[PDB]
Amino acid sequence: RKTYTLTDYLKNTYRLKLYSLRWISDHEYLYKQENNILVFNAEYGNSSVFLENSTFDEFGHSINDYSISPDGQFILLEYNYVKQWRHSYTASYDIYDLNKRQLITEERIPNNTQWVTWSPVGHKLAYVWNNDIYVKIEPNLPSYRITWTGKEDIIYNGITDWVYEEEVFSAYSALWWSPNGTFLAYAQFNDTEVPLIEYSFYSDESLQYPKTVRVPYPKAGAVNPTVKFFVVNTDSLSSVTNATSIQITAPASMLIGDHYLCDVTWATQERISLQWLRRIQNYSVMDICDYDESSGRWNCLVARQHIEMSTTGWVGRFRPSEPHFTLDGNSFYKIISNEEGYRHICYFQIDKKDCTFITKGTWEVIGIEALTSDYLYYISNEYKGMPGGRNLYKIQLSDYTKVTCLSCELNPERCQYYSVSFSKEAKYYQLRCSGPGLPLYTLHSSVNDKGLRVLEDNSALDKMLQNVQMPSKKLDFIILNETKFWYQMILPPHFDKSKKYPLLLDVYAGPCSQKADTVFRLNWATYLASTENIIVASFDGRGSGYQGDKIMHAINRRLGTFEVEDQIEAARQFSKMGFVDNKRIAIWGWSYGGYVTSMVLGSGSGVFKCGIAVAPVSRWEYYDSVYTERYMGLPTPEDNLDHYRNSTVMSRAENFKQVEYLLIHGTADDNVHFQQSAQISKALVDVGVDFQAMWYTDEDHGIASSTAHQHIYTHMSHFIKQCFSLP
Amino acid sequence: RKTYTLTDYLKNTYRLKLYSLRWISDHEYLYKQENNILVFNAEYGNSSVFLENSTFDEFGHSINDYSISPDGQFILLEYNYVKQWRHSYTASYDIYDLNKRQLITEERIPNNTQWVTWSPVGHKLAYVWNNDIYVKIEPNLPSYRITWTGKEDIIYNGITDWVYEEEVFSAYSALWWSPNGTFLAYAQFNDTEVPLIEYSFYSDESLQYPKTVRVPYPKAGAVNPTVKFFVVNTDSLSSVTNATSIQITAPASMLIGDHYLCDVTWATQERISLQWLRRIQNYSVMDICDYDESSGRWNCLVARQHIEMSTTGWVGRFRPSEPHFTLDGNSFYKIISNEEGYRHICYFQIDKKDCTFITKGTWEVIGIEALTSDYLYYISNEYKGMPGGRNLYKIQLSDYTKVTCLSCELNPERCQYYSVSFSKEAKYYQLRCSGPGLPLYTLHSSVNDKGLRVLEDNSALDKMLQNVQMPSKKLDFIILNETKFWYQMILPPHFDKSKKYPLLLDVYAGPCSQKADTVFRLNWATYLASTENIIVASFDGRGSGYQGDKIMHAINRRLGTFEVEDQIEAARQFSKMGFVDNKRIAIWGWSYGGYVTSMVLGSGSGVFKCGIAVAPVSRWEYYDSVYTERYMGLPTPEDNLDHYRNSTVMSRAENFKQVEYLLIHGTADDNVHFQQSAQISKALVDVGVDFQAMWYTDEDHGIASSTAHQHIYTHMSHFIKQCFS
Numbered sequence A: 001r002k003t004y005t006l007t008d009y010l011k012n013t014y015r016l017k018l019y020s021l022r023w024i025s026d027h028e029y030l031y032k033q034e035n036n037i038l039v040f041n042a043e044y045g046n047s048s049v050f051l052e053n054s055t056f057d058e059f060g061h062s063i064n065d066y067s068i069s070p071d072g073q074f075i076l077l078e079y080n081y082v083k084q085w086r087h088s089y090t091a092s093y094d095i096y097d098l099n100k101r102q103l104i105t106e107e108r109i110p111n112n113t114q115w116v117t118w119s120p121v122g123h124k125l126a127y128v129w130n131n132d133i134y135v136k137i138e139p140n141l142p143s144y145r146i147t148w149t150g151k152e153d154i155i156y157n158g159i160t161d162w163v164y165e166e167e168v169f170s171a172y173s174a175l176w177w178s179p180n181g182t183f184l185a186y187a188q189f190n191d192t193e194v195p196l197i198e199y200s201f202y203s204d205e206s207l208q209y210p211k212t213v214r215v216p217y218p219k220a221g222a223v224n225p226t227v228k229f230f231v232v233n234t235d236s237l238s239s240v241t242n243a244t245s246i247q248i249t250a251p252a253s254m255l256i257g258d259h260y261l262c263d264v265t266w267a268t269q270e271r272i273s274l275q276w277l278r279r280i281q282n283y284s285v286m287d288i289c290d291y292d293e294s295s296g297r298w299n300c301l302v303a304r305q306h307i308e309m310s311t312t313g314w315v316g317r318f319r320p321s322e323p324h325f326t327l328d329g330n331s332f333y334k335i336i337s338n339e340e341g342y343r344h345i346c347y348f349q350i351d352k353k354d355c356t357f358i359t360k361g362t363w364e365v366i367g368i369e370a371l372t373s374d375y376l377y378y379i380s381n382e383y384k385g386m387p388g389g390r391n392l393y394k395i396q397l398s399d400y401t402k403v404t405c406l407s408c409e410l411n412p413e414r415c416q417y418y419s420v421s422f423s424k425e426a427k428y429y430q431l432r433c434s435g436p437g438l439p440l441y442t443l444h445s446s447v448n449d450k451g452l453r454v455l456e457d458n459s460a461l462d463k464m465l466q467n468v469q470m471p472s473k474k475l476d477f478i479i480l481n482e483t484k485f486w487y488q489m490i491l492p493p494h495f496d497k498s499k500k501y502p503l504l505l506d507v508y509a510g511p512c513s514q515k516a517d518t519v520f521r522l523n524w525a526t527y528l529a530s531t532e533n534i535i536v537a538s539f540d541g542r543g544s545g546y547q548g549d550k551i552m553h554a555i556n557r558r559l560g561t562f563e564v565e566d567q568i569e570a571a572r573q574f575s576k577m578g579f580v581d582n583k584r585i586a587i588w589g590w591s592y593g594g595y596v597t598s599m600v601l602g603s604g605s606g607v608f609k610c611g612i613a614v615a616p617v618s619r620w621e622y623y624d625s626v627y628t629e630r631y632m633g634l635p636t637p638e639d640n641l642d643h644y645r646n647s648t649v650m651s652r653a654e655n656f657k658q659v660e661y662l663l664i665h666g667t668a669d670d671n672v673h674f675q676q677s678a679q680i681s682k683a684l685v686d687v688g689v690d691f692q693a694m695w696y697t698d699e700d701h702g703i704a705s706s707t708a709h710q711h712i713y714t715h716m717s718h719f720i721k722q723c724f725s726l727p
Numbered sequence B: 001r002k003t004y005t006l007t008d009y010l011k012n013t014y015r016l017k018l019y020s021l022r023w024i025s026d027h028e029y030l031y032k033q034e035n036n037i038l039v040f041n042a043e044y045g046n047s048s049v050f051l052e053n054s055t056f057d058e059f060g061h062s063i064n065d066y067s068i069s070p071d072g073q074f075i076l077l078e079y080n081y082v083k084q085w086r087h088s089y090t091a092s093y094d095i096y097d098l099n100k101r102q103l104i105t106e107e108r109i110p111n112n113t114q115w116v117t118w119s120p121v122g123h124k125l126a127y128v129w130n131n132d133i134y135v136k137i138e139p140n141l142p143s144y145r146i147t148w149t150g151k152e153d154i155i156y157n158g159i160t161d162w163v164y165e166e167e168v169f170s171a172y173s174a175l176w177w178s179p180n181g182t183f184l185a186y187a188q189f190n191d192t193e194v195p196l197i198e199y200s201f202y203s204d205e206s207l208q209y210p211k212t213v214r215v216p217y218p219k220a221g222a223v224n225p226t227v228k229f230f231v232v233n234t235d236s237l238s239s240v241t242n243a244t245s246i247q248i249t250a251p252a253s254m255l256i257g258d259h260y261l262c263d264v265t266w267a268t269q270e271r272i273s274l275q276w277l278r279r280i281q282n283y284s285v286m287d288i289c290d291y292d293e294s295s296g297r298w299n300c301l302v303a304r305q306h307i308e309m310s311t312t313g314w315v316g317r318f319r320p321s322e323p324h325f326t327l328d329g330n331s332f333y334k335i336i337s338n339e340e341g342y343r344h345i346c347y348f349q350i351d352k353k354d355c356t357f358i359t360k361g362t363w364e365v366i367g368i369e370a371l372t373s374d375y376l377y378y379i380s381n382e383y384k385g386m387p388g389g390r391n392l393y394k395i396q397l398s399d400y401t402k403v404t405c406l407s408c409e410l411n412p413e414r415c416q417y418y419s420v421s422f423s424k425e426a427k428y429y430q431l432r433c434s435g436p437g438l439p440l441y442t443l444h445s446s447v448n449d450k451g452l453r454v455l456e457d458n459s460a461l462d463k464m465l466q467n468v469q470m471p472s473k474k475l476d477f478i479i480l481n482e483t484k485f486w487y488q489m490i491l492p493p494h495f496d497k498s499k500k501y502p503l504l505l506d507v508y509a510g511p512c513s514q515k516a517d518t519v520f521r522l523n524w525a526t527y528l529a530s531t532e533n534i535i536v537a538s539f540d541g542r543g544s545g546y547q548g549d550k551i552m553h554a555i556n557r558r559l560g561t562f563e564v565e566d567q568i569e570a571a572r573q574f575s576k577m578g579f580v581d582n583k584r585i586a587i588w589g590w591s592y593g594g595y596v597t598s599m600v601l602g603s604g605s606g607v608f609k610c611g612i613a614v615a616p617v618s619r620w621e622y623y624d625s626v627y628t629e630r631y632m633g634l635p636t637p638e639d640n641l642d643h644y645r646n647s648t649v650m651s652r653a654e655n656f657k658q659v660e661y662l663l664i665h666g667t668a669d670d671n672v673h674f675q676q677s678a679q680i681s682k683a684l685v686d687v688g689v690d691f692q693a694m695w696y697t698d699e700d701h702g703i704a705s706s707t708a709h710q711h712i713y714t715h716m717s718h719f720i721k722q723c724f725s
């Protein structure tokens, strides 16, 4: 009979059970039960202890994560974890020999190691320390330095700089072992001329003088970092002296101007594919290079080049898709936009220029998951024509007309959103269901796709939620200009359309994003609907993804227009449904959602009463180049400079006199710098409009500190409750 | 019957008229008449035009200020004004020859000049460019370079570094001409090992990348800048060889450790007086250095030293007072605390250690204003025993019993707060009345204290103020430990003592500060009382000044204790007065007042419902050394580190759960760095205390921008009105 309180959300009273496993072979995986690392047999479900939970309570340090070598002879323990950016971090590492049950004390991995990674097979080790690459053949023998140009904030070897980590590779690592560990392919980034973003870091109050953090950050139109690619043979490190790292340059179509390295994928033991991207991200080229046995060099024939361009915007969703090569490495499958604007799987020959689409329709393929000699497993939103749904399909390679869905009918009521984790050779796979019901985990056999057992069904959480007045979720669409636009609402319990509720428009609306899906969540919206009786609505307008290039490319070179206007129009549609209080419609958003929310509140529409903007973008010349230029081009007069200045929130400061505005931003935000919100407030002051503000000391773009997280949602809860007059 | 609204205060609807004049001789002064500049004969009042407005309307630049040479033969023009800190600024200059009736176009003063100043007599010229001193014997001639060690952010010649500008000399200038311009004494500051404070500056929206401001800033206990003093003869600048400066070294009692240069005052033409201060600011020594003809050096005989120390706290109010030498330079008068803690004027002899006080009583002399052969003109708060009053007195140097007050009886109703401006030889003097009535400016003659004419009476403003329901002001005191502590209340119009009002506590409570005076003010408090019917009160507890060292030195080494508790005790007695609603009491403060406000809201007294803190101190280890160590010593375990940690507001974050809190601070605050407010918020987040916050981009400690000033007082008004309903 209780509601879902703010305390329940902040104190995490109702936890979603998970089942995170790590496949070590084609029929075995690892799992943590009572902090004991168990090894399971997928065929029969029985397990055995692989590492006791008391083995490392004598360690003296709180182990943050482990990493077992593929051959099972060693395990890398990382401690003193200190987060850096979204993916990068710094920590200490120790190697534990499993054939001796002892810690490695000789030739320990150096402190301040920036990244560690095992080889795909065996137990080789490559790590980045002081921006240089080292390789250890044995965990206890001395290392072999590979790079020598590594310089702080200038030269990156084996690791990415800020932009590449965030906007290109989505990872800190810039290393790529060959399939059997023979070769080590790495990239080198040079941020010599890249300007530095500078902001104060205050740290603990014991620090007398504030600290100044300086990070190479290429803003829109600024000097980008350069990149070089290398491949070194780690087998020659025995008679190493100074091992030679062979360089692979970019095609001539990329050397004419600024470019990026956007994908690295090995095909065979002696074949690696590289995808390059121009700074004008509408033209990318895949390069397939084979290892020359006699020359010791790498050669990429022009006949094996593959160009992927776009005539109505950028190429790919956030980057050119990654290829999935067959066993022989002479052909690959890749997601690309077809002539109708829908992204499907195309079959490429390593030699032929034209590819053949194996899937088609008014829907898109989210990703390729596994490839065997028989079938290719992919995820898509084809089922019931719902762009917000995810299901695992299986397409027959010998006949593209034989497509079977493996998750559509497992539980259509409870499960409409799926992810999959296949075994080493696609013999088994774990299906991850995340909505609209409670999460469900199941194991399966690829021989006939039978359900072996249920790993986790959240039956414990289901019982707790029975005596709780949980909200309901409606997933539907509206029609704007003969086009379906999907939306979702978190409806308060005992929803009655005879009444009129307050409306909170939860907004992100970033390019190729999706806010209306079938995923089940326990977040701030759950509390606002359950306890405060507030409808939390989300709307996927123009610019959202997984619906075709016609919608996703609608905001190309025009950020802050249709995306913003579609959110305002969505509010008008909701109020015209009967159960929305017109004088109590709010809007809030984080990151890109903060930018859209600010542009909405400064549009003079009069639709919204109040609004919250957390870590918002103010003007796009303040954001990084690779992301901004992808959708906005260059901020030069001969290019899209006119809209760079026409789409700032500062230029709408006057309209903020009609709304109640709350601006929040972390002082240590490395992504969307505090500069952005500092310019918003100063513009509002210059025109004399009052607003509420809140900075968070040393919090970054996530404001994920346990105390800060509880403090921000508490502060936003009061602002929303007072705006709606809710006691 | 309208009230004094917030718009009136933010728009300056009712403006006080002043009479800012600058004496050009012993019987004449300059005065600007909107467009041009006039010259007034003090004896008669007739005025001729000195410089027309059209003389520089063909300039091509905006005139920021004027500076006439002492001989009236040149005029220095200030333009391209760019403010730095409280006093420091950079600008361009152009000299205008009054005989040639045109500008000097040769050997002009370089752009980005840091400080300029004429000699006391004649028309010599000393300026500072790129931290190096230059001197022109003639405006249109090449300038001699005295110093060559000038280096930005490290070596300062003729100018003060940040901490010296703010806490020691209260000015950018580190130059001191001799009485007749023969010698040019200057100080050199070295910030080589002084840590730099770094904070981001965002500038205009066009700037794609924020800038990082870096300022040499010695926080509490950090490496302080070193100082050297020099004197150079300006009558013998060789056009071929460099200038040779004679260095005056500090006494041995100061060279044993860290020390400061806290005063420079010339006695005669060949005698200059220096005052040095140990880093532990309770011991100071004055040197009296005479120039040697043949030797060419300066000698400060040991027998001519004068020690000024304190056993109960620091020496001086904020620094040892300046001396006032006689005509022969063989004796001087200065303000020092007597053996009971009350600061009075002492008659010194150059060669004698003991001095004799010429004033006595349980009151303090605020300052010495003029010195003649037979009279000493000073200001004090002796009249009616009111520490919040200021009156001008003259004491006969031949008979210490013949003391006369020159301003007490002029207008006792309107005027209880006076400042003065004497002429070149103190032949005339202008009295500046500040309250409780409207400001009043009058001219007088020293021969018989006649009182010549009325300069400004604000009669035009008085006429308008009769149409607005203006608030009243109550000056009184309460008893704490059998001691009189004064307070003031801005009472709403038609004040009824049977009706209960919301009360706001306007607090500063810095050492040797005073918020309960007779000064008339038109400020945010005037609006809160006239329009919102809010009693805004101020209280001077232990630590306040002008009442003796027993009250001032009470907070020595214990900052954030008694002055914080006495604010709570006073508000407690305010709440139980019948006309104060004890359920609606707030407290707000700025700078040091924000620290006290934060310490009070976190005290757990439960007396206050809400409070506002603007650019407050949160941890004394964050503020600069000269100010902090003057009242707290060093942040070391063997000294006073115990209270440095006990007097933080972060340690009281837990007690903020029962109060509404508004924290405001400017991002570009070079004085009280934003760091201090960033640690307050972070401490409140760690304990889960909700509060209100508001930063201001690129604003400094004053938040004095036109748009920012209006925005903060508008934001604070909504906060107070909401807290009072």
Ligand SMILES: CC(C)(C)OC[C@H]1C(=O)NCCN1C(=O)C[C@H](N)Cc1cc(F)c(F)cc1F
Residues within 6 Å of the ligand: A166, A167, A169, A170, A318, A510, A591, A592, A616, A617, A623, A627, A671, A672, A701
């Ligand atoms: C997991 C999330 C959080 C969705 O990021 C994933 C990340 C990725 O690695 N792959 C797919 C997409 N993706 C990005 O687009 C990163 C962007 N920089 C996000 C972003 C956009 C803004 F406008 C902004 F102001 C700030 C931002 F942080």
Ligand SMILES: CC(C)(C)OC[C@H]1C(=O)NCCN1C(=O)C[C@H](N)Cc1cc(F)c(F)cc1F
Residues within 6 Å of the ligand: B166, B167, B170, B318, B510, B591, B592, B616, B617, B623, B627, B671, B672, B701
């Ligand atoms: C009257 C004004 C215009 C304020 O200057 C007076 C200045 C002067 O030159 N002579 C008299 C005393 N005096 C000072 O004490 C400067 C202080 N640093 C002020 C101050 C104190 C703090 F605790 C703080 F956190 C920040 C601050 F700015």
